[PDB]
């Protein structure tokens, strides 16, 4: 208690992934 | 007799060079399944013609029950060790494919027959069966394991290789027939380590890898001994064995034992990984695409994971090397040093900050190396450090990076484009509002990219534009910017037809963009709206036809719907209120009601999101349907589908706000499950937070209905919201709990210590909220008296005790 | 002569049609337009033969019938045509003519706006051929054109053009003279102002042409006079009797076209109010003439070796049907003498025509015919067997036109013989007697009902046999007959000996037919009649039948959605599949009752039903609302959850513009009441007001009024505190409705409602208490339970108003009612 | 004035095809 791991809120809908995407990367 | 005399002319017209017989024999081919096997097993002529009879036979579902599946099976099992090696293997494929057509049971002798052919005197009978038994294992036989284990010893290279190959397909199964024989396998593997045959050697490696994940207990006694071997196999001639050996380090690094075990080996290991992280054969196939998995990538992946295991302790083992690589030497040796620099990045970040002020400028320089493959990973490695670059004064790192990266997005080859455009999205994401000074500048290039790019990179561009809109928000709402970003997007929109899957990324982009542009999207919003509704309507209609008759109607790609719903949801979030008119005239809400019912979670997830969005924008029109929606909302409060659950939960919260007391009749069908979701162990923090707020919002609007159950949720409710920072939503939930507390104070008594902590989590609550907290905490101090209150708060940690004192005078 | 001299020989060989050129040259040309018109217009001088020259022009005519007309060389053809509409060789002129007329007809050609202006201008030519060629094309264009022609298409005001047309009545050749009349006729129905102002001229000129030796002018005059009868009655009224006597002669005209166009005059006159008084004196001459036009001759040899949909025989007959409905009994003096001889006269043809007359007379002069029936019916039953096919056919029909009387007599004397004879006729004859007998039998079934039960085995053998005997066309008439039986015999049809023969052919057609074949409509409508009558006997079949029906509805709805989203990419569905599947579902719901619940529970029928009730097409809503009431009654368990959803729609559809939807809505609402009881309360506001409005509405069909009366009653019985408030407003029409209807479990339940409604708001009845008494007096045999309610209310008011006031009031009573109410309820 | 009842739904089933007639 007393000390609060401070975090940004995740309130709201969970929007689905976009149908583009980024680079998979070197591996 | 007569058809076999034309089969010599059928496999010679499939051997004649002519293009006229390359079309005519293709028409005469598929026009049989008994005659071929005679040409291969019995019938004198050239040897390519006898095996080309096998290819068209193995090519050949109706003959599997037509009495021939006992006549062909007769010829192959009788001649499984033919003279030429070609014919022997062709039979091996044939025995496979005949049994491979499902799990066919026209063969009770099969397994017991081949497992008897193994002890034959004739080599090719033994090898033939073993090559057949292996093809089966890779596509009930567990009793063979101890017999398989015997062939590890005596025979050729080939037979030993099948022996280890077969036993390997049973480690995952964790079968008794092997698990009892653990040490015999392990010891036999060790004796097969020194084997001067690569095919054997990789299987031995692969086995030892699967053993890491299935029987850790047995390897530990040796471990430091197996590592020394694996380290040598990682370095092996023949890249196949090397790669299979590499998977070891990746697997090992996933077991808690790894940390303490490897420490000693690191100085030996790391150089070996890093050495494997460059390229040579694959190198020329890139100038003049390579595989999805090779030694380079595996070594890199291993090195990434180890960096995440050892963190900063990895540095002393690697920095030395990194210096010799990053600057010194040319192309390939350099390229790998920078890949190492990116690989290391996540794990040992903090330990590498000191080194960045010198390295990132050096990387920014490499962004224009005359070699493309050095350009590419430079983009990537840089993106792995985006968070530091953005945390420094913009003029020193951000400004030049954003400059060079933008150049790289355009021109070069397709591979540097990809890396750079994807890297820039990572920058946008970390930079956010820091890019407002450059919106026009950035947009200039990304619009050029839109003309230049081909389909594959186009996708990555869409993401960069989407990410831009998301990272910058309203700052995108300026006529200069909308004037350049919108035409290329409308062009594609007009160019594409409703059945084109290239419509997915475009609409998901246009969804992020529509939110960013608040009211700027008004000139464009009518047709965008109308098309989306069409998409949803057509998708559901086609699904109805398919439901009615699957025989005659193709089921639809519901992604057109998911994409349309997500764009309507972004339109609703952007225009909010302005959408009102469009909604009224359309039939979205009827369609949404079908969508909420759809069997595909994603379709439900998207519509609930839209439901909550439209509840805010124009509840006027959502209200008449509330009686219909709420039962479905109630149904979809099911944690099995986290995303659907979250969105349903979110929508309920949003709904309650819009109808004050009026929400009461609907609480029973929703409340229980919400209380069950919040008390649920191992539940995502997003779902818990949203569940926390919805409970709050509900009880705020209907205290009499929800307060009764205040004891059942107060604790998890507090434990959740307790950790998120101050916001307009946490405030709205805390009000609801306060109102409920001052209706059923009793329900809080039991876990009251958590409410005190939840109150102390606030740093700048609104004045009205500050008082509710105050009046409650005092009410309870008064209730139990000062003496009892002194006893209770003496059990608080210091910061709680002190802040409640200072802030609330209690 | 490179492209031309090669194409000029490809048409010369195309003429000589063997087996070769009839497929070679016909397909060679169909894979140009400019040179063909060059052949028809330029080479069609000495250089080539007329038959050849006009042929290239006619292939061009076929070519025109999209990429040809949108081309820029189309302007060369078009120019070339108008240069020689008056070519001196009749054949080439005729070719140019059909080429012009076709090009212009290709979508009201506005790429040819010079056309009509040049045509009207070419009427004033001196070359007769140019004048007649232009008037020819103008007439065809005026007539084909969907709209009438504005001054914008013409390039002259109609104020100039109308009187210019009338000028050509007055002199030219007979060809032009009628071209002229035809043209002005195109302006009558639109009530074109130019013509209305030139009415007296048009009329005067019409009388001038009446008597013209050319038949085409004459029929146009008749055609014109018929149109003006409807549009401009005020201007003919002075000359009526003089027009009638002209038309009387024209009906008798030498030429069959003129005769038919004149004959249409009576059909049109009959529709007009004045008809009765104006015609009376001409009946002595009109009727003999109509009857005469009702034989055949050339017709005859065609029918035994079909004929036109409409002709002088049908028209005269049709005219006689109407005229009968006008004068009724008053016509019989003019018809009976003539009918007396015909019915027995000659052989074959004259007799047949008399049988036709007798049927035609029926509806109109039914009452005045009753006397003659006991002697005529048996003669007709006797005629059913005549040697000649066409005498059997018409006899079937004429008998069906007296089906109602046959039914009302003792079943042994008329029905039994007729029915026996009719059942025979249904089979074995020619296709024409099958249709007539089968159709006629379906009429008889509808009228007979219970009276058929005796003969059900013989009836059911006949129709089922016909199934194998008949062929597509006659089969649809059979479907109607089997359907009518089921309906007219009900549960009586449910016996294993009947089921085991009726079902197999119906199921055979069921499996044979595919979901896209419009042959399902008569078949399924049949099964919905059958399923209801066979009640629980249908059980073995309901499973697959239900599943299919839902699919049809689902798919139609799906198809309608696609079309709505993409009209230009998806075809609109034929909604008749939906209407028919719904009707069969409702037929399962009625016959099976509770036994349907599972099928409903396990389906998505109610979700689908919900979209059907919102459909644009009244017929679709009408069907679904019937289904709603049927489901409400059979498995309310499953319906109830949706009550909140359906009621607002039910309320919307309480709109008498669509009498059949509004009726079924009303009926469903009341059936919902019974089922919910006091829970109905919240829903009454959205319904009651509209219902009181339609019961009070003048000129409303008996059925709609009755259903509204029962629905209000049921809503009352279930929510008195809700409906009683308005009792004063609806009781007058309420009583008026159920007053004439006989006793029944439904009428019973509506009165029980009114009674509980009174016993809450007794003030509401006072103002019209007279009617509520008449309503109680209509009941011939009340249930003992109802009797008490009526007494307690009636005596209860005697108690309120006082014994003195009660006597003075029950004095203004019609005498029989005073006695009826005095005796039956102790007043 | 007596009659038979018309209570119930109106099924206008115009898919039964009787003979158009002589005219």
Swiss-Prot record, chain A:
Localization per record: Nucleus; Cytoplasm
Outcome following mutation: residue 26 to S: In ALS20; increases subcellular localization of HNRNPA1 in cytoplasmic inclusions with stress granules
Regions of compositional bias (Gly residues) in chain numbering: 14-27
Phosphoserine sites (modified residues): 23
PTM per Swiss-Prot/TrEMBL: Sumoylated.
Residues that bear Omega-N-methylarginine: 22
Quaternary structure (record): Identified in the spliceosome C complex. Identified in a IGF2BP1-dependent mRNP granule complex containing untranslated mRNAs. Interacts with SEPT6. Interacts with C9orf72. Interacts with KHDRBS1. Interacts with UBQLN2. Interacts with PPIA/CYPA. Interacts (via the RGG-box) with the HOXB-AS3 peptide; the interaction inhibits binding of HNRNPA1 to the intronic sequences flanking exon 9 of the PKM gene, preventing inclusion of exon 9 and promoting inclusion of exon 10 which suppresses formation of the PKM M2 isoform and promotes production of the M1 isoform.
Biological role: Involved in the packaging of pre-mRNA into hnRNP particles, transport of poly(A) mRNA from the nucleus to the cytoplasm and modulation of splice site selection. Plays a role in the splicing of pyruvate kinase PKM by binding repressively to sequences flanking PKM exon 9, inhibiting exon 9 inclusion and resulting in exon 10 inclusion and production of the PKM M2 isoform. Binds to the IRES and thereby inhibits the translation of the apoptosis protease activating factor APAF1. May bind to specific miRNA hairpins. (Microbial infection) May play a role in HCV RNA replication.
Record's disease association: Inclusion body myopathy with early-onset Paget disease with or without frontotemporal dementia 3: An autosomal dominant disease characterized by disabling muscle weakness clinically resembling to limb girdle muscular dystrophy, osteolytic bone lesions consistent with Paget disease, and premature frontotemporal dementia. Clinical features show incomplete penetrance. Amyotrophic lateral sclerosis 20: A neurodegenerative disorder affecting upper motor neurons in the brain and lower motor neurons in the brain stem and spinal cord, resulting in fatal paralysis. Sensory abnormalities are absent. The pathologic hallmarks of the disease include pallor of the corticospinal tract due to loss of motor neurons, presence of ubiquitin-positive inclusions within surviving motor neurons, and deposition of pathologic aggregates. The etiology of amyotrophic lateral sclerosis is likely to be multifactorial, involving both genetic and environmental factors.
The protein's name: Heterogeneous nuclear ribonucleoprotein A1
Gene encoding the protein: HNRNPA1
Part of the whole protein covered: 315 to 341 of 372
From Swiss-Prot, chain C:
Signal sequence coordinates: none
GO biological process terms held by the UniProt record: protein import into nucleus
Keyword terms: Acetylation, Cytoplasm, Host-virus interaction, Nucleus, Protein transport, Repeat, Transport
UniProt-annotated site: Important for interaction with cargo nuclear localization signals, residues: 397, 667
First and last residues of every HEAT repeat: 6-31, 32-67, 76-109, 115-152, 159-189, 202-229, 241-268, 334-362, 374-401, 415-448, 456-489, 497-535, 543-594, 605-636, 644-677, 685-720, 728-761, 770-801, 804-824
Predominant location: cytoplasm
Mutation effect (residue 667 to A): Abolishes interaction with the ADAR nuclear localization signal. Abolishes ADAR nuclear import
The keyword Protein transport appears for this protein: yes
Ranges where the Importin N-terminal domain occurs: 28-87
GO molecular function: nuclear import signal receptor activity; nuclear localization sequence binding; RNA binding; small GTPase binding
A GO CC term attached to the entry: nucleoplasm
Compartments, record wording: Cytoplasm; Nucleus
Organism domain of life: Eukaryota
Cystine residue pairs: none
Protein family according to the UniProt entry: Belongs to the importin beta family. Importin beta-2 subfamily.
Its job: Functions in nuclear protein import as nuclear transport receptor. Serves as receptor for nuclear localization signals (NLS) in cargo substrates. May mediate docking of the importin/substrate complex to the nuclear pore complex (NPC) through binding to nucleoporin and the complex is subsequently translocated through the pore by an energy requiring, Ran-dependent mechanism. At the nucleoplasmic side of the NPC, Ran binds to the importin, the importin/substrate complex dissociates and importin is re-exported from the nucleus to the cytoplasm where GTP hydrolysis releases Ran. (Microbial infection) In case of HIV-1 infection, binds and mediates the nuclear import of HIV-1 Rev.
Assembly and binders: Identified in a complex that contains TNPO1, RAN and RANBP1. Binds HNRPA1, HNRPA2, HNRNPDL, RPS7, RPL5 and RAN. Interacts with H2A, H2B, H3 and H4 histones. Interacts with isoform 1 and isoform 5 of ADAR/ADAR1 (via DRBM 3 domain). Interacts with SNAI1 (via zinc fingers); the interaction mediates SNAI1 nuclear import. Interacts with SNAI2 (via zinc fingers). Interacts with RPL23A (via BIB domain) and SRP19; this interaction is involved in RPL23A and SRP19 import into the nucleus. (Microbial infection) Binds to HIV-1 Rev.
Descriptive protein name: Transportin-1
Source species of the chain: Homo sapiens
């Amino acid at each position: 208690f007393g000390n609060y791991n401070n975090q940004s809120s995740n309130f709201g809908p969970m929007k689905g992934g976009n149908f583009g995407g980024r680079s998979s990367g070197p591996y | 007799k007569p058809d076999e005399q034309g089969l010599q002319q059928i496999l010679q017209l499939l051997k004649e060079s002519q293009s006229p017989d390359t079309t005519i024999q293709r028409t005469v081919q598929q026009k049989p399944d008994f005659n071929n096997y005679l040409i291969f097993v019995l019938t004198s002529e050239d040897e390519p013609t006898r095996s080309l009879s096998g290819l068209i036979l193995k090519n050949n579902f109706q003959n599997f029950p037509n009495g021939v599946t006992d006549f062909i099976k007769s010829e192959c099992l009788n001649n499984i060790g033919d003279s030429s090696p070609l014919i022997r293997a062709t039979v091996g494929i044939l025995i496979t494919t005949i049994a491979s057509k499902g799990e066919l049971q026209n063969w009770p002798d099969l397994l017991p027959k081949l497992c008897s052919l193994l002890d034959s005197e004739d080599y090719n009978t033994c090898e033939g069966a073993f090559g057949a038994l292996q093809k089966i294992c890779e596509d009930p036989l567990n009793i063979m394991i101890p017999k398989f284990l015997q062939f590890f010893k005596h025979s050729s290279p080939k037979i030993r290789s099948h022996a280890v190959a077969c036993v390997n397909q049973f480690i995952i199964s964790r079968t008794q027939a092997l698990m009892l024989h653990i040490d015999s396998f392990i010891e036999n593997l060790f004796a097969l380590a020194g084997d001067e045959e690569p095919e054997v050697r990789k299987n031995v490696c692969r086995a030892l890898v699967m053993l890491l994940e299935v029987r850790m207990d047995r390897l530990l006694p040796h471990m430091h001994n197996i590592v020394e071997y694996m380290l040598q196999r990682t370095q092996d001639q023949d890249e196949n064995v090397a790669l299979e050996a590499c998977e070891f380090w990746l697997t090992l690094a996933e077991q808690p034992i790894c940390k303490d075990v490897l420490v000693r080996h690191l100085p030996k290991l790391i150089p070996v990984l890093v050495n494997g992280m460059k390229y040579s054969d694959i190198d020329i196939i890139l100038l003049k695409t390579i595989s999805d998995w090779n030694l380079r990538k595996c070594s890199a992946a291993a090195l990434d994971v180890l960096a995440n295991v050892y963190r900063d302790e990895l540095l002393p083992h690697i920095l030395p090397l990194l210096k010799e690589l990053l600057f010194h030497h040319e192309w390939v040796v350099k390229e790998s040093g920078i890949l190492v620099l990116g690989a290391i990045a996540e794990g040992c970040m903090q330990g590498m900050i000191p080194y960045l002020p010198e390295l990132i400028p050096h990387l920014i320089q490499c962004l224009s190396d005359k070699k493309a493959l050095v350009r590419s990973i430079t983009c990537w490695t840089l993106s792995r450090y985006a968070h530091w670059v953005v945390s420094q004064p913009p003029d020193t790192y951000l400004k030049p990076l954003m400059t060079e990266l933008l150049k790289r997005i355009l021109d070069s080859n397709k591979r540097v484009q990809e890396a750079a455009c994807s890297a820039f999205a990572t920058l946008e994401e970390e930079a956010c509002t820091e890019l407002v000074p450059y919106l026009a500048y950035i947009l200039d290039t990304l619009v050029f990219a839109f003309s230049k790019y081909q389909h594959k990179n186009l996708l990555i561009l869409y993401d960069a534009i989407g990410t831009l809109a998301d990272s910058v928000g309203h700052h995108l709402n300026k006529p200069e910017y909308i004037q350049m970003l919108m035409p290329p997007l409308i062009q594609k929109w007009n160019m594409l037809k409703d059945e084109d899957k290239d419509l997915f990324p475009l609409l998901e982009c246009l969804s992020s963009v529509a939110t960013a542009l608040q009211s700027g999207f008004l000139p464009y919003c009518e047709p965008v709206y109308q098309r989306c509704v069409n998409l949803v309507q057509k998708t559901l209609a086609q699904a109805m036809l398919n439901n009615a008759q699957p025989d005659q109607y193709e089921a639809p790609d519901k992604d057109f719907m998911i994409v349309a719903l997500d764009l309507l949801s972004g339109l609703a979030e952007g225009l909010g209120g302005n959408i009102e008119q469009l909604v009224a005239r359309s039939n979205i809400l009827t369609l949404m009601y079908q969508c909420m019912q759809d069997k595909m979670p994603e379709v439900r997830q998207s519509s609930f999101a839209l439901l909550g969005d439209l509840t805010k924008a124009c509840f006027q029109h959502v209200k008449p349907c509330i009686a219909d929606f709420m039962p479905i909302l109630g149904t979809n409060l099911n944690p099995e589908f986290i995303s659907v659950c979250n969105n349903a939960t979110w929508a309920i919260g949003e709904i309650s706000i819009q109808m004050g007391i009026e929400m009461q009749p609907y609480i029973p069908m929703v409340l229980h499950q919400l209380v069950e979701i919040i008390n649920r162990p191992n539940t995502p923090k997003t779902l818990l937070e949203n569940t926390a707020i919805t409970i709050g919002r509900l009880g705020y609007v209907c205290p009499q209905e929800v307060a009764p159950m205040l004891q059942q949720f107060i604790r998890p409710w507090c434990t959740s919201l307790r950790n998120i920072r101050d916001n307009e939503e946490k405030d709205s939930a805390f009000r609801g709990i306060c109102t409920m507390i001052s209706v059923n104070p009793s329900g809080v008594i039991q876990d009251f210590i958590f409410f005190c902590d939840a109150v102390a989590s606030w740093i700048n609550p609104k004045d009205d909220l500050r008082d509710m907290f105050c009046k409650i905490l005092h009410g309870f101090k008064n209730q139990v008296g000062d003496e009892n209150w002194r006893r209770f708060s003496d059990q608080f940690p210091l910061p709680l005790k002190e802040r409640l004192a200072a802030f609330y005078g209690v």
